[PDB]
Structures are given as C-alpha cells and as structure tokens.
Amino acid sequence: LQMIDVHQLKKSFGSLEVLKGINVHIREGEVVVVIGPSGSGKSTFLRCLNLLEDFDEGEIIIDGINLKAKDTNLNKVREEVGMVFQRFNLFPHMTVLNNITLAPMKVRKWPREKAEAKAMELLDKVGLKDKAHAYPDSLSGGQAQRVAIARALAMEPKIMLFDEPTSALDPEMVGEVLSVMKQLANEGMTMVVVTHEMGFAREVGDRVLFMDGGYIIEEGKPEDLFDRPQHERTKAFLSKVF
Amino acid sequence: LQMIDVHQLKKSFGSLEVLKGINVHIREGEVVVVIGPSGSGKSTFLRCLNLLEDFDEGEIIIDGINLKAKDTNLNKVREEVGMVFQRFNLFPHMTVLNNITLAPMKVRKWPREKAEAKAMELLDKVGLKDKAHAYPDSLSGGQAQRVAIARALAMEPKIMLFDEPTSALDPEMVGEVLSVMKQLANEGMTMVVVTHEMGFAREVGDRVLFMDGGYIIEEGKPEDLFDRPQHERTKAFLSKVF
Numbered sequence: 001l002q003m004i005d006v007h008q009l010k011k012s013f014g015s016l017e018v019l020k021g022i023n024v025h026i027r028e029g030e031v032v033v034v035i036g037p038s039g040s041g042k043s044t045f046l047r048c049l050n051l052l053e054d055f056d057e058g059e060i061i062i063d064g065i066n067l068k069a070k071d072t073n074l075n076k077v078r079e080e081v082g083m084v085f086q087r088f089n090l091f092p093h094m095t096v097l098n099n100i101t102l103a104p105m106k107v108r109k110w111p112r113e114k115a116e117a118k119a120m121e122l123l124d125k126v127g128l129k130d131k132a133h134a135y136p137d138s139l140s141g142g143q144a145q146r147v148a149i150a151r152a153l154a155m156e157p158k159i160m161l162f163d164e165p166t167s168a169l170d171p172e173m174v175g176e177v178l179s180v181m182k183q184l185a186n187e188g189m190t191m192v193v194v195t196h197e198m199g200f201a202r203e204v205g206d207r208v209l210f211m212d213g214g215y216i217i218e219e220g221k222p223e224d225l226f227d228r229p230q231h232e233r234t235k236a237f238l239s240k241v242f
Numbered sequence: 243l244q245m246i247d248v249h250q251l252k253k254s255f256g257s258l259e260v261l262k263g264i265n266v267h268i269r270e271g272e273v274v275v276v277i278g279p280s281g282s283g284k285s286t287f288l289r290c291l292n293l294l295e296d297f298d299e300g301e302i303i304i305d306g307i308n309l310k311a312k313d314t315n316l317n318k319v320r321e322e323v324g325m326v327f328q329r330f331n332l333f334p335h336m337t338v339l340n341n342i343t344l345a346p347m348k349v350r351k352w353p354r355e356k357a358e359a360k361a362m363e364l365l366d367k368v369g370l371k372d373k374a375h376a377y378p379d380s381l382s383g384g385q386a387q388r389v390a391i392a393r394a395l396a397m398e399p400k401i402m403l404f405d406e407p408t409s410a411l412d413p414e415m416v417g418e419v420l421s422v423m424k425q426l427a428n429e430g431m432t433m434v435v436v437t438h439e440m441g442f443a444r445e446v447g448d449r450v451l452f453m454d455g456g457y458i459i460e461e462g463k464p465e466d467l468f469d470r471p472q473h474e475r476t477k478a479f480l481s482k483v484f
C-alpha cells in the first residue's frame with residue numbers, strides 16, 4: 001500500500017466525469033493489472049499516475065510523496081515513473097540506441113559512454129542488442145514495443161506503467177512483449193498494466209482491477225476475479241474478452 | 243537545379259555500401275515518388291535529405307545551401323525540411339494540439355495562442371479539429387498519420403518528405419491520408435514520397451524514381467515508368483508489386 005496511493009480520484013473532461021471516485025493502493029513490487037471495456041478511464045487513470053494529466057479531486061501519492069503538495073518536485077517524480085503506450089513510443093528519426101540514451105543523458109545528466117553501456121545492457125535483456133544502430137522503421141511491432149520498454153527502463157524507474165502495449169500488435173508479436181513484461185515482474189518491479197490479454201493477467205498479476213464507467217467495480221486475485229466474478233458487469237465483460 | 247540537389251551521393255554502413263551514387267535534382271513544387279525493393283536505400287536517402295544521417299561521398303544542396311559548406315547553419319535547413327515516417331510520428335504522452343505546437347514553440351519561440359491558432363487551422367485542413375484535445379492512442383491509423391502531417395506542416399516547411407506514410411495502415415485508412423498529401427501536392431509543395439501507392443503516383447506525381455541496390459536504376463513520368471519501363475529490373479520489380 002506504499003508505492004502508489006490513490007484516494008477518491010476524480011477527473012472530468014468538462015461534462016464527462018471519466019474517473020468517478022477511484023481508490024487503489026499499490027505496494028512496492030506489486031504487479032497490478034487493469035481490465036475493462038473502452039471508455040472506462042483506464043488510460044486517463046495511468047496518465048494521472050504519470051503526471052500527464054491533472055485531476056479534479058482526490059489524492060495521488062507516489063513513493064510517499066503527494067502530487068499536489070506545494071513543496072513537491074513533480075519533475076523528480078516524472079522520472080521515477082516509466083510509461084509504455086500502445087503506439088508512438090519511439091523517435092523514428094533516431095537509432096534504437098539513441099532512443100534509449102536520450103533521456104538518461106538529457107534528464108539525469110549521464111555521460112554518453114555510461115548511458116550507452118546501460119542501453120546495450122537493456123537491449124541485451126530484451127533480445128535486441130543486434131538492433132542498437134537500426135532505425136525504428138527497420139523494427140517489427142514486437143521489436144519496437146520491446147525497445148519502448150528498454151527506453152523506459154533506462155531511466156531506471158521505480159514504477160512501470162503499461163497502457164495496452166500489445167493491443168496494436170499482430171498476435172504473432174504479442175507474447176514477445178509479454179515475456180519481457182513477465183520477466184520484469186519476476187524482478188520485483190512495481191507494475192500497473194492495462195491489458196486485454198487475460199493470460200498475462202492470470203499468469204503475472206498480483207491483483208486485477210476491473211474498471212467500468214469510471215469506477216473500479218470489482219477487484220482481487222486473478223484466479224478469484226476471472227474464475228469466480230461476483231458483479232454482473234464483470235461477468236458481462238469477461239463473457240466477451242481476450 | 244533549385245529545391246533539392248544531389249550529386250553522386252554515397253553512404254555506407256561498414257563494408258555495406260547502401261547508396262552507391264545517387265544523382266537527383268528536384269525542382270521547387272515538384273512531387274517525386276520513390277519506389278523499389280527493401281534495402282534499396284530509400285529511407286537512408288530521405289534521412290540524408292532531412293539531415294538525420296551523414297554521407298560518405300557526394301553533395302547535397304537544399305534550396306541553394308550545401309549541407310557540408312563551412313558557413314552552413316544546419317538547424318536552419320532542418321527547420322525548412324519536414325518529414326513523415328511510416329510509424330512513430332506522434333508523442334503518445336501529450337494531446338494532438340500539443341504534438342503540433344511543440345516544435346514551433348521551441349524552435350520559432352511562438353507564444354502559446356499563436357502556435358495553437360496555427361495548429362487549429364492545420365487540424366481543420368486535415369479534417370481533425372475535433373481531435374485537438376484527444377490523445378494519439380484514441381486515434382485511428384488514418385487519423386494519427388494525418389496529425390503527423392499536421393505536425394510537420396506547423397513548422398511551415400518548403401520540403402515535405404514522406405517515408406511510406408501509408409504502409410503500416412489498414413487499407414481503409416490509406417485513403418484519407420493520401421487525400422491530404424494530394425492537397426499538399428496541389429498547393430505547390432516540393433514533395434519526395436516513398437510509396438508503392440500507384441494511384442497516388444499517377445495522379446499527383448511528376449516523376450517516379452526506381453531505386454534498387456543503392457542506385458536509381460530508372461526514372462521518368464509515372465505513366466511512362468509504370469506502363470512502359472525500359473530497364474528489366476524495373477519491369478521485374480513492377481511485376482511482383484503492381
């Protein structure tokens with residue numbers, strides 16, 4: 001309940017209150033999986049967590065610091081949270097290596113040799129050291145998404161956010177990215193993963209949160225949630241998804 | 243030999259000669275379509291035009307300025323050349339309006355409302371003003387790629403490069419992207435378009451360059467190159483694609 005703390009979170013886009021009061025508390029090293037239909041506020045939720053969107057009411061605490069406290073450095077938090085999106089993760093005009101090294105050099109003021117040493121180490125980890133000097137256009141979707149992960153890991157964050165990282169990919173490219181994320185969980189990374197891939201959720205997630213219409217409607221262990229859902233809306237959603 | 247001027251352009255990656263003597267001279271307002279097999283150097287070529295890659299031998303002159311002359315402001319050339327890639331054109335972490343205004347604000351130091359009025363009219367022209375405050379991942383491929391053109395146009399370039407802008411799109415999304423590109427061609431923009439979209443090439447294209455193995459093997463008017471190719475490599479390539 002220590003790494004991410006969310007109390008009565010609400011958000012509105014004028015008329016549409018997209019997050020209608022949500023509560024979640026994520027411990028250090030916990031993999032939490034977010035599921036639910038389109039328009040639930042799943043991405044908005046992740047954005048608030050990543051300081052990409054401000055909220056209308058409630059509280060967000062990350063690593064024991066408040067996002068709306070006057071004294072708190074938001075830029076310092078920004079670099080402790082990583083985020084991988086469904087698309088557009090890479091700079092197409094830069095090599096794979098320079099994608100990864102850009103922020104660690106620009107933000108954390110690392111020297112080139114140091115940053116590239118760690119970038120090659122992460123490319124090794126994802127199975128793409130042989131693509132260091134390649135351009136994003138040369139990469140398949142599964143390879144591009146694995147570079148996005150490596151990009152995010154180079155800042156060495158405390159939390160990794162994943163917004164449907166495999167949703168835009170062909171089925172032959174999905175498990176590629178899921179195994180990197182799977183491996184990332186095995187190394188004690190606090191992860192929030194928005195996904196429709198339920199086999200990942202059950203295999204990897206510590207808790208599953210079912211979001212619908214701006215609420216977290218049901219939550220709990222993957223086995224508990226998938227096998228024995230209690231809420232009609234959870235049942236309805238699970239009757240048509242993977 | 244006005245807008246783009248290339249003489250015996252050569253580029254290697256190690257012992258791999260990727261461009262082997264490119265000579266091409268693009269007039270102002272000319273729309274050049276580039277076609278050819280994978281590994282032809284089409285993307286490398288466009289990168290050289292866009293100052294994203296250095297070259298081993300030869301000369302490149304964008305609008306009367308030599309990219310290797312001593313007194314050359316490279317950044318001032320960079321800002322007059324726009325580029326749309328196959329994928330990764332957008333920042334997923336910021337809104338559509340912000341994607342477009344980022345560069346004119348940083349590079350041209352425009353105030354926010356100035357840049358935004360320009361972005362809004364650009365979104366209008368590509369038929370997407372309603373998506374101004376939306377995030378990239380809410381967009382279709384067709385939409386995303388139109389915003390990618392809007393981003394590029396916000397810098398007010400005189401050269402627009404397109405590296406397979408519709409390749410990674412579902413076929414129904416291909417149409418409305420080529421409509422924007424056509425409008426851009428019809429308005430006098432100097433365009434280099436790497437594309438295997440024949441209808442586009444025939445309609446708004448002035449010339450077609452057939453690249454293969456680091457050379458421009460054959461060139462000419464689209465009708466002429468498409469319907470009566472002179473070189474057997476061009477014929478063979480046309481037979482397997484169109």
Ligand SMILES: Nc1ncnc2c1ncn2[C@@H]1O[C@H](COP(=O)(O)OP(=O)(O)OP(O)(O)=S)[C@@H](O)[C@H]1O
Pocket residue numbers: 013016018036037038039040041042043044045337375376377
């Ligand atoms: N920047 C924005 N401006 C206005 N409305 C928005 C914005 N972002 C999201 N919305 C609204 O919020 C809903 C989208 O939900 P999201 O917050 O994107 O979460 P989500 O559940 O991931 O959505 P999907 O489509 O399932 S991935 C839509 O109905 C939008 O109208």
Ligand SMILES: Nc1ncnc2c1ncn2[C@@H]1O[C@H](COP(=O)(O)OP(=O)(O)OP(O)(O)=S)[C@@H](O)[C@H]1O
Pocket residue numbers: 095133134135137255260278279280281282283284285286287
């Ligand atoms: N940064 C790099 N390092 C090493 N090799 C490269 C690099 N960039 C390109 N190449 C190689 O150069 C050759 C031609 O590159 P491109 O310009 O991408 O060709 P292309 O015609 O665009 O091919 P595609 O895949 O149809 S877009 C390919 O064999 C690449 O493997």
Ligand SMILES: [Mg+2]
Pocket residue numbers: 042043163
């Ligand atoms: Mg979403």
